[PDB]
Every structure is written in C-alpha cells, then in structure tokens.
Amino acid sequence: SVSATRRISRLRRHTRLRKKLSGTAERPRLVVHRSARHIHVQLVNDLNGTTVAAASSIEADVRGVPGDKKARSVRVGQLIAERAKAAGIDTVVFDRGGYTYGGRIAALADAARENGLSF
Amino acid sequence: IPVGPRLGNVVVEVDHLDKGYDGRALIKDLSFSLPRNGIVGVIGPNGVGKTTLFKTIVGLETPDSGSVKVGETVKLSYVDQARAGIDPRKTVWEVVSDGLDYIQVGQTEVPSRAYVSAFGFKGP
Amino acid sequence: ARLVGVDLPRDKRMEVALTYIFGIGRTRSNEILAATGIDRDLRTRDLTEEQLIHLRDYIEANLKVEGDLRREVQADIRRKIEIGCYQGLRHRRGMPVRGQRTKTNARTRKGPKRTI
C-alpha cells in the first residue's frame, strides 16, 4: 500500500522533530496539517494539551480567495497570525508536521511572520 | 612483465605512412613491419615525431595518407611519456586498483597489494 | 549480418561465410547460392537486405540449422544410452564407438596421457 505508508512515514517524521520542539504557554506551537485540498493550523500549548487559536482553509473566508493553493495558504497564514494576537501571543515555534519546509507551508510561515508572529 | 597470449605472424604493418600537423610534415612515406620476438629501438632527436608514431599505432591519432594495420592476435600495451594516467591527489595503491582487492594482469588474478608490492611499493 | 541467429563475419566470401552456420558446410552452401541466384564470389558486406530475405527462407524450408539440429544430434546420442545398445555403453565411458582400436590410440574420445 502507499496510503498506509504515507501516514506511518509522516507521523514518524513528525515524532522525530517533536523530541526537541515542544512549545509552552508563553511560546505556543504552530502545528500545520497539509492535505491535498486544504491546510489546517492550530497553536497547541504542550503542557495541558489546549489549543488556544486555530485557522483552516475549509472555512468560508479562505475558500473564496482566487488563485492557486499557495495563495490560500497565505490567507490562512494571515488568519492565525491575527488570532494569536487576540489571545496575547507574539512569539511561537513552528512545527513542520513531518512535511518539508517549502511550498505551501513556507508560504504559510512567511505570511505569518509579516503579520506579527516573530519566529 | 606479465606474459601475454600467442603472437601471430603479422604484428604491426605500416605501408606508406604520412603524418603531420601543419605545413611541417613529420613522417613521410614510411614502410616497415614489426617483427615477432624482438626488441625494436626508435632513435631520433627531440620534436621529430616519435610519440606521434606510437599514437597512430595505438589508435589515438589519424594518419594523413597510408594506413596502420595491426592484426587479429595483438593485444597492445602502452606506457606513455607524459604519465597522463596517474593523477596526483590519489594514492599509489588505488590508482593501480580502484578500491578493488584483486585485479586482472592478463587472464590471471593476482591480488592488488601483492601486485604493487612486486613493484617495490611495500608496506605503508 | 544476422541470417538465422549466427551473425556472419564481415569481409568474407559468401561461398565460405555461410559455412559458419551450424548445419551448412561447403556443398550445401553451394546450393543456397544456387536456388537464390546470389553469386559465390560476393563479399558479405555488400549483402543486400532484399537479398537476405531470399536466403532466410530457403533454409527454413529445406535445411536444418542451429537449435533444432543440435537438439537432434544430442537426442540420437540420448536414444542409444538408455536402450542399452553397444554404442550406448560405449558413449557412457568415453571410448570410440565405430570399432576403433583402443590399444594404442583413441586419444580423441579420451583426453591426453594420464601416465600411470
């Protein structure tokens, strides 16, 4: 199989970078989840497991943005940047999610550094 | 020197060879044939056309007029004046070999470090 | 030029070049070059693709060449051994079959000298 290979291989890449990157209450952790159609993102606070802010491409604001999938990654990257600042967050650590930094995720990350977050 | 296979009655035949690079002509109308079981010496001053005579025989040049003819039996071995095969930033072992243990020296397999230590390069 | 799976050697006269096929010698190669009109004194480098079709089918209708000839020679030897005839016992031991002399010769069915 290849669909069962890809889940096991990316949650092993996700555990490898998780040993050294955890994220706390004053510096939360921006966790991306990249599918073929959308991307989801949330700030997780790994001391009691509590998401403080979240944004996704499946809601109505990101769905009506013209262009490719990188431009919808920029739009969801601007949403969780302006939702982190409504909860008192201005510095986070960036969780790759097991993926490769580049493409849609680096377009999410660079669109969140322009709008306030300082990673 | 390792011995090779059986050598025929026709070793190298040269019939009316002409060779040059420019208006200066080096070899002009030469006819000879290399014998079987002998030592042949090539004599001449510098810059006169002796390494070009080998490089038409080994197949790295092209004659102007006339042909070079070898024969079906001859396996050719060619040491060179310029030492072009040996590269400086590679050790004396792994130029003879290529990281391999055993090499071919003509239908036999001697070990490579046993081969270079037969050429004086012994130990470290 | 491949003819039946034999890959004829270049610069060789067609009288003799066809004899490198396992199954054709000098007399049978004289009738390959008779029923197809190709002359005897022609080199094999000048062999036309229109010519080579004419003698890749006269052989397959009238001759017996590689593969299905060499599997007839080794099968007739195979017939003699398990039926237990005299030549079959004589093939299993490497001694000559056609009533030859085995006292001072037959160094072809046998090897070189063993020298006890």
């Binding site: - | 990281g99 391999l100 243990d101 055993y102 090499i103 397999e109 | 799976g5 890959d7 299905d68």
Partner: protein
Amino acid sequence: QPRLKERYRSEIRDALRKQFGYGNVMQIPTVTKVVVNMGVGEAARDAKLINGAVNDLALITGQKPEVRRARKSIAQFKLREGMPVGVRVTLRGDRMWEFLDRLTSIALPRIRDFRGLSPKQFDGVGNYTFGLAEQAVFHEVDVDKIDRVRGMDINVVTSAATDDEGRALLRALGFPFK
C-alpha cells in the same frame, strides 16, 4: 502517448472484469514498475563496468542506471563491502509502457533459438521475472562497439494479488508464454 498504454485502458482494462469478478474498478491490476539489472559479478576484478555495463543500459532503457554496492564481504567471491557489483535501472510511468512495447514487439523474438517464456516464473503475488542472454537483442546497443557480452534479468511488478491474476494481465500485454 504510447500505444501500449492506450491499448491497456481500451480493452485489457475491461476484459479483466470478465475473467475475474471484481466489484470495484480500483481492484483491476496494473503493472507499476519494470526493474532491469545486469548484476556484473566480474567487476570485483578489473574495475571496468562504467564503460561497459552503464553505457549499454543507458541505451537500452532510456535513463542512466544506479551502481549498486555489495552489502557484506564474501571471501569465496573475491568481494568486499561497498564494492560495485550491480547496475540497476528502474522504469516508471510512460517510459515503462514504451519499454514493454519495445521489448515484446521487436526485441524479444531476436533471442537465438527462441521458443517462449515460462509461465511458472511468478513469485507468489503476481510479479514476473525472466532473464536474457547478452548485449544482443536490443538494437540500441550495437554488436561492434562493445566489450565482453553480458546479460540481464527483468522484473515486472504488478498490483495483482495472486499468480494467475498476473498471468492474465501479461498475456494480454503480449508476453509469449507456453
């Protein structure tokens, strides 16, 4: 658009729903890769496979191969670890369909005294593997500009679950069996 690929999804793809009773079109088998390697064991001596075993599989299959190294040392085979002993090329996608056409149409009946391929060479899941003779059959290499002759062996890897499910697939593509 290669002709063997379009012939696959025109009548081969539909015929396997009749010979085997599948309930879904995703279950229909499909060849996924064709792996070719020389396996040059006479490279632990003489170190000459770059000129001879790489320049020919590049011409046969289309892309340059990978040199494979030995995993463990064997004293009886005159071999080390990390020594070049094998040369592999993997064919995917549209160059797979062009190689499987060019193998079965014009190549494979150039084997000297050819009589077929055996249909018992499945591994148990549906993956066929045969072997060839030398640097003959493929026209893209020539017999005059080469070193010593050397053969290969060719895997064909399908998505079929069992043996005869892959036998019916390769009979339709054009492998001669007996």
